[PDB]
Design a protein around this ligand. Structure first.
Ligand SMILES: Nc1nc2c(ncn2[C@@H]2O[C@H](COP(=O)(O)OP(=O)(O)OP(=O)(O)O)[C@@H](O)[C@H]2O)c(=O)[nH]1
Ligand SMILES: Nc1nc2c(ncn2[C@@H]2O[C@H](COP(=O)(O)OP(=O)(O)OP(=O)(O)O)[C@@H](O)[C@H]2O)c(=O)[nH]1
Ligand SMILES: [Mg+2]
Ligand SMILES: [Mg+2]
Lengths: 171, 171
DNA sequence: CCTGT
DNA sequence: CCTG
């Protein structure tokens, strides 16, 4: 298996293009309340998880919930693309404020896999150019993650590696 | 600082070209008996740390010492280039034999930096082609380290990052 | 340096 | 999708 060690008090930041399987992954490995999703927050503020015009409010809400959880010492997983440094920056800062270990889990999957999954989705889709861009941003992000403040950086390089992941939570 | 978390029982594998500063780094961060060096082993078997013809015997000795230490539950740092997969393979296997966690620390420095340092050494030098080769092998190695069995993979991307390292030995 | 042979 |  692919064992990923994380401390009991972690902020797990999922990094991946739309279609890379972040939400599917989060549901398999974590409790529902441990996972806070940017799309869910778009729904919380606007009724519409697909409404990009409420992104600002959605991430304000996400960051707020993350802060409340870390204040209470609860492990939290951020289910958003997190492919822009500007998106990861405030998450690292919140983790620092509450002495929480930031962990990066990167879905380094081929653009074509994400595009294929997106084409076959029935829940929500994005345009092809979005996935092309997210994949490029994800790839450019990998080198600098440790320096950004991620204490553990785990890169998953194929669907096979994603499937094999087992988290080892250390108390 | 660049905080690198490692378990009390770790096999820390330094990965870097000649001239990348492995031995300097090892002395700064670890007690002498925690560090086992391939060049020191060349000296043990032949009187000459620079004798490349005794490489087989030197690594036999290094592996034997690593095995004894991990068996005794002692943190161990391997100071060798470790830029070939075939070199890392037995280290991972010995770690697994004794339920020890392998940690990779990669000196991902520009070839030019290593060459300049090499040029100014008075203790021992290698030819430029050696460093060019080591650097290429190091860079080609990075992606696959987690899959090889390294439970923690830390990549240092500049002399500034190397200098900033602080190990956090979790009990 | 896990060896330009 | 932190909005080409
Ligand atoms: N075959 C296969 N399909 C998967 C896997 N993971 C996710 N999928 C499918 O890919 C599609 C996208 O998966 P999601 O988990 O929603 O992807 P996401 O990264 O959360 O995408 P966004 O929310 O748009 O950012 C879904 O229809 C899944 O059923 C996988 O591991 N294997
Ligand atoms: N400026 C600077 N010089 C360094 C640093 N680390 C090592 N050096 C110099 O670079 C040269 C090589 O350093 P070593 O620690 O011996 O490098 P190594 O990786 O062990 O090299 P090999 O034993 O040949 O594989 C030495 O002369 C060091 O003094 C550093 O962090 N900063
Ligand atoms: Mg999702
Ligand atoms: Mg050395």
């Amino acid at each position: 298996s692919m064992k990923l060690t994380i401390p009991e008090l972690s902020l797990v930041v999922l990094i991946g293009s739309s279609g890379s399987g972040k939400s599917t992954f989060a549901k398999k490995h974590f409790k529902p309340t441990e996972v806070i999703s940017s799309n869910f927050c778009r729904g919380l503020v606007s009724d519409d998880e697909n409404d990009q015009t409420v992104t600002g409010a959605a991430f304000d809400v996400l960051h707020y919930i993350v802060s409340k959880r870390l204040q209470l010492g609860k492990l939290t997983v951020v289910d958003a693309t997190n492919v822009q440094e500007s998106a990861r920056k405030p998450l690292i800062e919140i983790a620092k404020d509450y002495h929480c270990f930031p962990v990066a889990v990167v879905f380094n999957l081929p653009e074509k896999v994400c595009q294929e999954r997106n084409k076959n989705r029935t829940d929500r889709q994005v345009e092809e150019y979005v996935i092309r861009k997210h994949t490029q941003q994800m790839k450019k992000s990998i080198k600098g993650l440790q320096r950004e403040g991620f204490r553990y950086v785990y890169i998953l390089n194929s669907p096979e590696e994603v499937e094999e992941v087992v988290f080892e939570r250390q108390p």
